[PDB]
């Protein structure tokens, strides 16, 4: 996260770290959506241009964390993966369209002060909140600058951007399964996701029922926190029918 701040304790209890077993390293962010299911970006698990194709036993998920590198004894919980599900129409060849994946855990994780699931949006919550100017919140342990790494989880609040502005900022083909967020050069605030934040959540707090909803997944960008560039996020509601199909079939 570039130009964010340290998270408060328990601020994002749905935050998940995807952790590579060997070498031991941060792979990506992710989020907890139930006691057995974790949501992330497909490109965290599968991206052939970079020879990335992880299998279940390559990875762990670490839940309840705050410190990036510490083993947070008595606080974090470490879970093994039962099965990875990548969207069948994830477009890794072109533009990361449908950049979404689910992971089922081998055993349910116990909820605590530090571990709690986020909600997924309904159509009405999405329609109400996914509007230009409305701000969401992005969290992660990724790089602090494009060109180092944080001691603890970082947070930044960013406004959703008008779709024509998103489109005019990039040469990548945007789709309805994406949205973009960030400040404009004029606005005098900044902030962005960066490498290592992939797969983490873009959340919004509904003013109707005071619950946090995950509206996006950190997906792609051109650099980090560049003027005139924006971060792009998987549109979680647009892909919710797939999410539900997987959980109904396999949960």
């Amino acid at each position: 996260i570039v130009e964010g701040s340290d998270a408060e304790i328990g601020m994002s209890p749905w935050q998940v770290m995807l952790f590579r077993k060997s070498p031991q390293e941060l792979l990506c962010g992710a989020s907890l959506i139930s006691d057995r299911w974790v949501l992330t970006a497909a490109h965290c698990l599968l991206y052939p241009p970079w020879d990335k194709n992880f299998t279940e036993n390559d990875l762990l998920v670490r839940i309840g964390k705050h410190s990036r590198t510490r083993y947070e004894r008595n606080i974090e919980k470490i879970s093994m993966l039962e099965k990875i599900y990548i969207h069948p129409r994830y477009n890794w060849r072109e533009n990361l369209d449908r950049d979404i994946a689910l992971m089922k855990l081998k055993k349910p994780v116990a909820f605590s002060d530090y571990i709690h699931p986020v909600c997924l949006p309904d159509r009405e919550t999405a329609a109400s909140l996914l509007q230009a100017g409305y701000k969401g919140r992005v969290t992660g342990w990724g790089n602090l600058k494009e060109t180092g790494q944080p001691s603890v989880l970082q947070v930044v609040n960013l406004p959703i951007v008008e779709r024509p502005v998103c489109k005019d900022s990039t040469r990548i083909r945007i789709t309805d399964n994406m949205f973009c967020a960030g400040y404009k050069p004029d606005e005098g605030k900044r902030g962005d996701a960066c490498e290592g934040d992939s797969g983490g959540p873009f959340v919004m707090k509904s003013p109707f029922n005071n619950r946090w909803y995950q509206m996006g997944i950190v997906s792609w960008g051109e650099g980090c926190d560049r003027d005139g560039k924006y971060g792009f996020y998987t549109h979680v509601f647009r892909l919710k029918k797939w999410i539900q199909k997987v959980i109904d079939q396999f949960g």
């Binding site: 952790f19 077993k21 031991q24 390293e25 941060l26 590198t69 510490r70 083993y71 470490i78 093994m80």
Partner: peptide, 11 residues
């Protein structure tokens, strides 16, 4: 630069 995690999780 990651602290070792308990061996049980790497089993």
């Amino acid at each position: 630069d990651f602290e070792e995690i308990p061996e049980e999780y790497l089993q």
